[PDB]
């Protein structure tokens, strides 16, 4: 994942669709249900290098479901300091009624999961195999 | 905390490592000066994500380390060459916008003279 | 990559008149997050214009910057012996280019 299109508007610290990238702040993730870091982007168009600065730098997260389609969901951080979900888990990405997927800024976005025991799973979402990281009790 | 201060000047050889200390608050910044010409952008820091951006021309060699406790924001440059003869400064961006990064910087230190020759 | 053409490339004037740099730029740089700088010999950068309108703190009145897009404007109202030095104009994007400088030197 590259920092360079990485939205950072940080002040005073169901379907996804499409979000501008002015009122989110840190990295946003979406999960296959492997964790993957979307840049900010154009709206259709190249990744912009510009830290979510620019008020055209958007987030493209329109979705299908996963097995041959886009990520499940995405969850991520916004100005405010409040976490914004979307879409649907595989609230958090839950892979398994206690079990959420184990992603670096899964702290950060979910600090109530911090006493979590972290396990290496196995998750088959249509003919493909997953080797994730999961968070469970 | 009125200013930062920086390490002092030191002189390397070819190919070599040199460190910069940083010693002081958001978006601590490099960027360097040679002797008669403009001044060259390096990677600036965030101290709340631990993670730094850097520019096209050294990202491969260009790492920014930061110290916990005290604000001790260092700056390692490896495989030195003639090019790199120049001062260095750290700066902290002031008054940041909504934009954690984009707000310009303000205050700088006093400049580390950092020699590479043979 | 953004370039940024820096114009005059050696302003010469008196003490009392009013000086105009130019910061013509390839691409628009994001929205007024540019900043301006000036640099005297032997000591670091300060920053006079920042967000391409607002002044900074303890900068004085006299200096003023303008322009949007691709076009920039730094006037000094009025030009003091403590105002002779070079000028930078820092850009909204990854690369955050500099420009070349402008010398500001007494005419003689």
């Known amino acids: 994942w590259h920092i360079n299109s990485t939205a950072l508007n940080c002040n005073e610290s169901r379907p996804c669709g499409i979000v501008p990238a002015k009122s989110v702040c840190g990295p946003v993730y979406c999960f296959t249900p492997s964790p993957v870091v979307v840049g900010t982007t154009d709206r259709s168009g190249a990744p912009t290098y510009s830290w979510g600065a620019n008020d055209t730098d958007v987030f493209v997260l329109n979705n299908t479901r996963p097995p041959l389609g886009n990520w499940f969901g995405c969850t991520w951080m916004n100005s405010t300091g409040f976490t914004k979900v979307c879409g649907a888990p595989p609230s958090g990405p839950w892979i398994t009624p206690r079990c959420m997927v184990d992603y670096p800024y899964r702290l950060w976005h979910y600090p109530c999961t911090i006493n979590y025991t972290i396990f290496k799973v196995r998750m088959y979402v249509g003919g493909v195999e997953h080797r994730l990281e999961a968070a469970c009790n | 905390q009125l200013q930062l201060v920086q390490s002092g000047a030191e002189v390397r050889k070819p190919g070599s490592s040199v460190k910069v200390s940083c010693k002081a608050?958001?978006?601590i910044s490099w960027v360097r000066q040679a002797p008669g010409e403009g001044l060259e952008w390096l990677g600036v820091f965030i101290p709340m994500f631990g993670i730094a951006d850097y520019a096209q021309k050294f990202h491969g060699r260009v790492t920014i380390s930061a110290d916990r406790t005290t604000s001790t924001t260092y700056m390692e440059l490896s495989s030195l060459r003639s090019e790199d003869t120049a001062i260095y400064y750290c700066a902290k961006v002031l008054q940041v916008g909504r934009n954690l990064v984009v707000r310009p910087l303000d205050l700088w230190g006093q400049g580390t003279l950092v020699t590479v020759s043979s | 990559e953004i370039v940024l053409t820096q114009s005059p490339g050696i302003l010469s004037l008196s003490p009392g008149e009013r000086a105009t740099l130019s910061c013509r730029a390839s691409r628009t740089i994001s929205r007024t997050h540019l900043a301006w700088y000036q640099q005297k010999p032997g000591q670091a950068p300060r920053l006079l214009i920042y967000?391409?309108?607002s002044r900074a703190i303890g900068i004085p009145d006299r200096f003023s910057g303008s322009g949007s897009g691709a076009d920039f404007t730094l006037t000094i109202s009025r030009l003091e012996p403590e105002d002779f030095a070079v000028y930078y104009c820092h850009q909204g994007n990854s690369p955050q280019t500099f420009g070349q400088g402008t010398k500001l030197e007494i005419k003689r």
């Open positions: 608050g958001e978006v």
């Open positions: 967000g391409v309108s």
